[PDB]
Amino acid sequence: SRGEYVVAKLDDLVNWARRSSLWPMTFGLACCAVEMMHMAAPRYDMDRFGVVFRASPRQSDVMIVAGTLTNKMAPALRKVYDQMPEPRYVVSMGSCANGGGYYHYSYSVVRGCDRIVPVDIYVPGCPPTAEALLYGILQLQRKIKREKRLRIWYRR
């Protein structure tokens, strides 16, 4: 159908716009922030891909939970996630953020950031090498590319 074709092309356009301009927020708790900065460093510079670090959660599109998420820090993480406008994607970097990692059995550690906020891409590693983080970001971009928001709207 022509309407389906127009909807598909428009969804391609919006998905391309969103994946090309991914603005992660300057959110790094523990060691994995260092490898995140090394991704921002010149060797694997994220700005080429359109990835730009913007401090404001309201001006940001992706949250990278780079570090151990403690019980004390968890409510703040949830708050910053909620204040972030949609579409919003969460990338969990590090074994600590994915499932608790080294401090899984700690009384003061949330065993994975999935418990607090929904997670789209999990980046394994401790620390995940900056190349692995860039790979995870590109996988997130492909995930956005596969989204079919307008198609589902037209099918209703």
Partner: protein, 156 residues
């Protein structure tokens, strides 16, 4: 941070982890240096001086940078000692204490280096101390490269 990436490469070559390696263990070191690493460290160190000099050019004598740090965070030497400060925090205030010289631990008794000492105990003096300590670390690295002994890397 480009130089940081290169030093992470050195870490990766010795241990297989860019950071958070388990190289230094009780009883010595886990594995001997892979062949060819020391000369690569030589190549890196012979040029690192120009990079740190460029950093000084950008920051050391800049009017704005001095204004932001010339007299902020002043700590008295006695106050620094009492509050338990250590390292540059002490040496910035002018007290002369470096555990590498005063109570050498491994082989620092066999290396020659100068402890940078500040005079006004401010952020700018600490900046100067940190930069100089880097230079002295480069000197120590040259010394260690020249006189690395042959033999075992862990206790027999």
């Amino acid at each position: 941070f480009e130089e940081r990436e290169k030093m992470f490469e050195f870490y990766e070559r010795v241990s297989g982890a860019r950071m958070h390696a388990a190289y230094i263990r009780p009883g010595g070191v886990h594995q001997d240096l892979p062949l060819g690493l020391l000369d690569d460290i030589y190549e890196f160190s012979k040029n690192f001086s120009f990079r740190i000099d460029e950093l000084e050019e950008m920051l050391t004598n800049n009017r704005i940078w001095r204004n932001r740090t010339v007299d902020i965070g002043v700590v008295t030497a006695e106050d620094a000692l009492n509050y338990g400060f250590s390292g540059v925090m002490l040496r910035g205030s002018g007290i002369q204490w470096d555990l590498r010289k005063t109570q050498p631990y491994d082989v620092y008794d066999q290396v020659e280096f100068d402890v940078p000492i500040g005079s006004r105990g401010d952020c700018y003096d600490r900046y100067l101390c940190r930069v100089e300590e880097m230079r002295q670390s480069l000197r120590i690295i040259s010394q260690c490269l020249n006189k690395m002994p042959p033999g075992e890397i862990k206790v027999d």
